[PDB]
């Protein structure tokens, strides 16, 4: 359960969605970009917390933030 | 020297280990001093 | 050819490393200005 | 503060000795602090207990021998660090599962303590490894040379 | 402080002379270390009296001073000689040494180029031309 | 053909059918073991658990113990030691069925856990398991400390000393 | 069909690319944006695997920089007899090898240095060399410094040759990758020409030059009546004295070989195995006869593997036939395949075999570590304490670096060159398969071992300062006997089956001492119960290095945290703070940790030779047999509590570089200072990150800034990999001057 | 001397709360301290 907020800073250069593990960020269409595109956040209870997203943002500081927060049974990825 | 003569070694390698597995394109007379030189070596 | 490695003769760590070979005077200056040579010594 | 008390110590054993001119003449260079302060004064800490016998310092030079255990197994918490032990409390996890007759099951999963909190265990154990070391040395080597 | 004589007269500092192998090391340097302010154990020492001593607590103070600047400046100015030259990225790895040798015969007489780069508020950047963190 | 299959047929579970967990052998002993046999009761469970522990923890203490140089002294330090560890041991085993047993067991004792290797699971069957182990192991330990104690009257009886 | 294939002309050679360094990344040339890109420049400079893609132009690489590899060993090499020839005092130890100490490496008068070169007998002022060069050359035959310093020119001209193959290889006529990858045809000439004829060189030497010369050099004839090596097969009448039961003759002395009547040689090759007693080392008839048998069993070795005349054995489907219809029934587990798609693996891929040959180097280093004292091959090796000393300890370090490469290209091989299709449910595949029951049951055994080697040192530790020495691990309280050990040190003394060795080889193992200079060469090691317990400690160091090093090769391609961890590479930091934090989760990590596991076991195996050869072999004799040992019967009673390790052990024996200063050995007491400096320097990369150096810099490049002297090179701090490596680099280097300080100036203090 | 004693009065008292404090309670204190960090919230 941690917290993935995406600010307006974006460009909808979709690379943040790729480097997730768990899928946890997608695209919505938007209207601040020439992609028209954002990143949001719809899974983030499977966020697992790796940043993984935050380095491939561009953006100088970068418009993805992984905020870690209560970490639960698949927020820190146990398989036991 | 006189007897040793080893030659009966390399001769019972050379009707013997013509049987290998390529035998083609001889090394039982190069084994045939292997074997021939332990053994008479090895009972003076 | 003799343009390209000149240029790397004085590239980074080959300055460097020739300066430090250079900076060896405290090793002449300092073997015959009588090698002991402190503060209150030198003039 | 290691420098504080080093230097206070063996200011006041020089002093108290009578063997002024010991810090005077080789505090001026690192092996003095090396050869004088530190091997000097151990040799009766050290002896607290040897194979010939035991004193009053046994307890001494066992702490002294703790401290420095306490330190090492710092480093243990400070160099390695957590992932690595993630994967192997990761195996041992595995290994209770699919053990017969081990009937304990943990009611909250075994993880490799965390990033922020290893850097304090492992600076609890350099501080008490540093005072238990330093406590010992210091009061065995003038509670021996001395009442 | 009057405890430190001069190594002319201190007891515990001829016993260093009489002991002393030559080799190259423990006479020509030794005797110079007669005209030093010398402890109550044989061991010259670096003291400031007054007057007395001003020129020689001023000898390597000056000297290391103006040939640290010396590394200093010429080092500086050929930074802002690359910088506007627009190469500095790769001047730096390769350094071009005519540019840096006339750069250190301009560091030569540093302490004067200096006074002209503060009073034509020059040397030091103004405050919002410098990247920052926020705060 | 392989002698080494994955385990109990499903590629994806975490072990691996082997001669030493899942052979003829192996499987009779360590499920005739009683912590697995078919059969029992909790109490004879650990009943049975604890009468080999107890018996068997007295001997490290008794030969190279603090008090393994005179006789009558070292067999009170081995007994009491299998005291010590059972009766922590068992206190051991009590809060962890309390503390396990809270309404849906997070792990291997849950209600859908479906695991051969711990069948304990209710808090019925864990009770009757320590007070089986706890006395297991204070008869098991009582045992081995009275054939020591008498070991002299012992050693005679098995030597035909005693005609 | 074996043959040779090779480019012509492939490379070109010019200076264009020494002008533009990084080159060989396209990351690394594109400029030098911050200074991150210098130490990247020098982390990736020998990484040919990611410099080009295809397998022939790298193993080009590879064949062309072993070439400039030994050149760079014969400038060594030529600097050793250079020294040796024009800075020593081989000349005067020739004569009198006990009294004189060995010295090369003189030092300049400068900087007051001039008292580092110390007094060494015979008046020579110079530094004690402990590389025991001088017991090798006389073992060699070396007699004047002449033939020392023609070596020296013999091995600067053969330097210059290794530069012009490894250029000719790269440039003029590059092979193609089929003669690299015919490894079956490169065993049968190592086995045979290399390692096969080395040996039956060298016993030709040891025969014609070295048998003679230290004939007679024990006689004592003092380096007059000493003949050149020439002149022994020059003048064949001059080696009749001298074995007489040969003949030495062009051909009329050969002929005995040829006609099997081998008893003729059986005063210069003999079988006696022991130690020669005038000098303390091996018999050299007894070495010459060694490597003549070496030398017939290697090229008789190189005759296995088959080349292009059919005969022979193919590695290739030997591997192959390995699977699980044909095995011992007990060991039939290792799958169907077994071993198919491993001889692609050895093939495709240099990781793999740099794996195994460093393993094995590594192992092979410390073997020979262990076998240079136990039987001192060199004359007048074993008297000199500080070359024993300073020989094993060297060979121990070389050989515990080169195994802990092996597991970092076992791991590199997993997350680079790991086939999954060519390496499916074969021998490879089924051990990644239950890599959770390997790790489990090496974490329990080294966990097994840890209580019951160290913790057994706390239970003495804890009896002795209660003052219950008789509750003690002792060979006085409760007895730990090394039983199995004791028991082959009985059999290796009864044998003396092979009985023709009369003479028990390796004193070590029992029976009789041998002083040679009223020093002792070489006594029975006995073993008691502080041998048990820190035979367990070595076992215990040497288990949790395997368990660092094996865990980071079957967990470098995935775990349970990240099942892609192959993707992020070799050597990553971490997969950042979630999961708990992964920090240190790379395989290179667990080479980085398995780095101090070697320092600690390898420097405990060092310290337990250290002082068991002080107490109970090394010493002197006197004029009525009774060994008085350096620290006398020390180890049994104290080695068993590690407060015993600190007081008879570290403070003690350690006054030697304490109170080292104004005198000679006053170079070891600056290094013992630096090795101190340097490993608590190292902590400063090892318990900071660079969150804290970066945001430091940033303070730093303001004030820069705010003077107009910023660098275009953007200062960085160093990657957290590169802060791991500098930490890890200074805590090995540092930990280990600090010991090479304290062994030399104990033992050069002494002999 | 071969024996711990107590010149202090009360010396018996040390005898007895030594192993209380240090080996005898504990691990009930243990046991009660850990079900008090390990209960549901229901
Ligand atoms: C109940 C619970 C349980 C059980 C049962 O049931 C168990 C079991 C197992 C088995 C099967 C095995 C083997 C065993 C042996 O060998 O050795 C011993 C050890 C021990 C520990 C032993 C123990 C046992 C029991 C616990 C006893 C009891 C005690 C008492 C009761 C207490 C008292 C009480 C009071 C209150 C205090 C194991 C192990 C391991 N662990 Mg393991 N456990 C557990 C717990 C725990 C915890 C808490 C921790 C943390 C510390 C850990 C840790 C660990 C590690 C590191 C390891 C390793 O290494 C190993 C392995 O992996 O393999 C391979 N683990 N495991
Ligand atoms: C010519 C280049 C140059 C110049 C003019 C300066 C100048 C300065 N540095 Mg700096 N520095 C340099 C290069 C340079 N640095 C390099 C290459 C490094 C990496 C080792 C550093 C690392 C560094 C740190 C960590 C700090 C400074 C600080 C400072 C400031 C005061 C302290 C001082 O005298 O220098 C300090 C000098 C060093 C630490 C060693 C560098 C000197 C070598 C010899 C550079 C010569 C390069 C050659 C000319 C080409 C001062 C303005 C301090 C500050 O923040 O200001 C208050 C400070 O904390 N420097
Ligand atoms: C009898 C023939 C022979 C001999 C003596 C060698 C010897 C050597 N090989 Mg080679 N090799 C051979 C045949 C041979 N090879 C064949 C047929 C192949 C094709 C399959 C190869 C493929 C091969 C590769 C890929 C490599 C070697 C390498 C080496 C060197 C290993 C370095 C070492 O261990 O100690 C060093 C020992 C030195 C003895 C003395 C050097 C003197 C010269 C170089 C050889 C002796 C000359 C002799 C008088 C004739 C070594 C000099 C490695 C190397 O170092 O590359 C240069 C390596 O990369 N070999
Ligand atoms: C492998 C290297 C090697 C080399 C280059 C030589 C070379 C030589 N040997 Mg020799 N030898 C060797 C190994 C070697 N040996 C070994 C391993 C043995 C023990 C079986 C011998 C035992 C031997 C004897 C007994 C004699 C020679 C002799 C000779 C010299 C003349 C014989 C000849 O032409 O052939 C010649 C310079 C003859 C000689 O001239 O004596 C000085 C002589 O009679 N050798
Ligand atoms: C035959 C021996 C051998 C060979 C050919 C290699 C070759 C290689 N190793 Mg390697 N390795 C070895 C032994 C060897 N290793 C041993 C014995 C160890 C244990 C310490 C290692 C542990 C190791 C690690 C952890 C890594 C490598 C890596 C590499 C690759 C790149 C090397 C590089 O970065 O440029 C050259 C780098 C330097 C020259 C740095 C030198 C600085 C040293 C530490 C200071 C020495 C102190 C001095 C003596 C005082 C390269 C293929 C790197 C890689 O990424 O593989 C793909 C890598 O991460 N090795
Ligand atoms: C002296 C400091 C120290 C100590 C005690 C340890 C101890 C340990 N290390 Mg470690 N390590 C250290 C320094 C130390 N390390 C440093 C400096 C590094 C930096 C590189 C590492 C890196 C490292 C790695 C990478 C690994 C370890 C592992 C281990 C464990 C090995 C298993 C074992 O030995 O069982 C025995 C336990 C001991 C020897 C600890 C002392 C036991 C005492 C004597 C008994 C205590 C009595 C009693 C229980 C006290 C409790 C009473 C109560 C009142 C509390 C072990 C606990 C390995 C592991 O996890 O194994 C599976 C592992 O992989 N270490
Ligand atoms: C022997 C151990 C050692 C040494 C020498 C240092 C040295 C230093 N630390 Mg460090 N530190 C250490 C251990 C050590 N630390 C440990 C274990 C920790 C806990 C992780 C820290 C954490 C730490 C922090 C957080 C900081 C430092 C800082 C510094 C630097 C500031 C002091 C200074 O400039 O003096 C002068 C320089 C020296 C004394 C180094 C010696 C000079 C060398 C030998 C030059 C010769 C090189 C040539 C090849 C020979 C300095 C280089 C501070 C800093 O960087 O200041 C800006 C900083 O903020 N340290
Ligand atoms: C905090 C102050 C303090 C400290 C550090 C100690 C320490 C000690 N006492 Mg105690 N004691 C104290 C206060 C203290 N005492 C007071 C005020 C009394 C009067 C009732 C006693 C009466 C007493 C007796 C009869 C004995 C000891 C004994 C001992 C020794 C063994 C431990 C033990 O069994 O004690 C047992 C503890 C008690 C009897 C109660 C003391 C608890 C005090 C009142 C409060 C402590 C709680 C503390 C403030 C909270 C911190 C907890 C946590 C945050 C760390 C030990 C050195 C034994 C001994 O003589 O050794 C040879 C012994 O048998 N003490
Ligand atoms: C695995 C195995 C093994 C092992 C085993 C073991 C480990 C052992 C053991 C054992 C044991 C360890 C046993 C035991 C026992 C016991 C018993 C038999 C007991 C008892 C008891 C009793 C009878 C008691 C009683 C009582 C009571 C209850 C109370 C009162 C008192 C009295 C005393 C009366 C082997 C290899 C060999 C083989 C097989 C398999
Ligand atoms: C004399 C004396 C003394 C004292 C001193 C003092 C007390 C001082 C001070 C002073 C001060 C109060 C100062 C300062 C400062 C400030 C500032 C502000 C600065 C600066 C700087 C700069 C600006 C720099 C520049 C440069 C140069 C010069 C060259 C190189 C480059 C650079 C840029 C770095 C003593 C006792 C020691 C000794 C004896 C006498
Ligand atoms: C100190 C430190 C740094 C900073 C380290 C630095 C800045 C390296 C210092 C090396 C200096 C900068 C060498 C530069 C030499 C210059 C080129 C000067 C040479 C010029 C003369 C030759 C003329 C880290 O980046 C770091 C990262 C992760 C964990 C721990 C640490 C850590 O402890
Ligand atoms: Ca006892």
Known sequence: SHTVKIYDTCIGCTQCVRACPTDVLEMVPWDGCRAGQIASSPRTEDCVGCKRCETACPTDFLSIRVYLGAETTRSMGLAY | XXXXXXXXXXXXXXXXXXXXXXXXXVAAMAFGHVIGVAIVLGLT | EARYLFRYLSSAPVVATLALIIISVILIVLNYLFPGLQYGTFF | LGWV??????????????????????????????????????????????????????????????????????????????????????????????????????????????????????????????????????????????? | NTTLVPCYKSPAFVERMKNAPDSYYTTKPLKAYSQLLCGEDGLPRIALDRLSLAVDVAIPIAIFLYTAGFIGWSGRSYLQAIKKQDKAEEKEVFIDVPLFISCMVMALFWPMAVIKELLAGELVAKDEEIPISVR | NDIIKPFKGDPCLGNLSTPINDSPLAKAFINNLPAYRKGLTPFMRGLEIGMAHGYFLVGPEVVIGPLRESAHGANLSGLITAIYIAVSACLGISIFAITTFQGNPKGSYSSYSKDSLRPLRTREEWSQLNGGIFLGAMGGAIFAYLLLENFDALDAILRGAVN | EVRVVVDNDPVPTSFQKWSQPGHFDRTLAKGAKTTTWIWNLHANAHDFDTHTSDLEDISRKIFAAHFGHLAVVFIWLSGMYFHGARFSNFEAWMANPTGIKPSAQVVWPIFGQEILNGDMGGGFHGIQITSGLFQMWRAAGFTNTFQLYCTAIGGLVMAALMLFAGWFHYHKRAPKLEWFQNTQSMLNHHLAGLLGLGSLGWTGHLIHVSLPTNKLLDTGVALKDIPLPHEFILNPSLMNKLYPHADWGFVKGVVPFFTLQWGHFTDFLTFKGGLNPVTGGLWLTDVAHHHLAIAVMFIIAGHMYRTNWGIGHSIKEMLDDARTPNMLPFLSFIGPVGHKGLFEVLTTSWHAQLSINLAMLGSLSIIIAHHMYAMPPYPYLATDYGTVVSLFTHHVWIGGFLIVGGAAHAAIYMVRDYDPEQNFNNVLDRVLRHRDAIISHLAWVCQFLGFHSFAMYCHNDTMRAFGRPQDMFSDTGIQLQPVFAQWLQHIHTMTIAAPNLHDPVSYAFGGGVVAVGGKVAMMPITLGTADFLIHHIHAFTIHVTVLVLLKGVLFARSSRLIPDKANLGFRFPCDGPGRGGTCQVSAWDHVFLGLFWMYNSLSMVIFHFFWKMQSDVWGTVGADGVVTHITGGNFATSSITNNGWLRDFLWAQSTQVITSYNTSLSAYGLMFLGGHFIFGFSLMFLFSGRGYWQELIESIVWAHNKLKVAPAIQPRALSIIHGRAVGVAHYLLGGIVTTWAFFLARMTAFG | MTQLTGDYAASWLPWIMIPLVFYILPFPVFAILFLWIQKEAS
């Not at chain 4, 002093?15 to 003095?32: C, D, H, K, P, R």
């Not at chain 4, 303590?113 to 290893?118: C, D, E, M, P, R």
Request: no cysteine; proline share 2%; aromatic share 22%.
């Open chain 4, 5 to 147: 008390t080093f230097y206070w110590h063996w200011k006041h054993l020089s002093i108290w000795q009578g063997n002024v001119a010991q810090f005077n003449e080789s505090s001026t260079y690192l092996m003095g602090w090396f050869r004088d302060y530190l091997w000097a004064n151990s040799a009766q800490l050290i002896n607290g207990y040897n194979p010939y016998g035991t004193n009053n310092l046994a307890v001494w030079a066992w702490m002294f021998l703790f401290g420095h255990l306490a330190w090492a197994v710092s480093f243990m918490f400070l160099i390695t660090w957590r992932g690595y032990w993630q994967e192997l409390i990761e195996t041992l996890a595995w290994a209770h599962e699919q053990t017969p007759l081990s009937f304990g099951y943990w009611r909250d999963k075994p993880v490799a303590l965390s990033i922020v909190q290893a850097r304090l265990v492992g600076l609890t154990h350099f501080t008490v490894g540093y005072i238990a070391t330093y406590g010992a040395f210091l009061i065995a080597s003038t509670a021996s040379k001395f009442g």
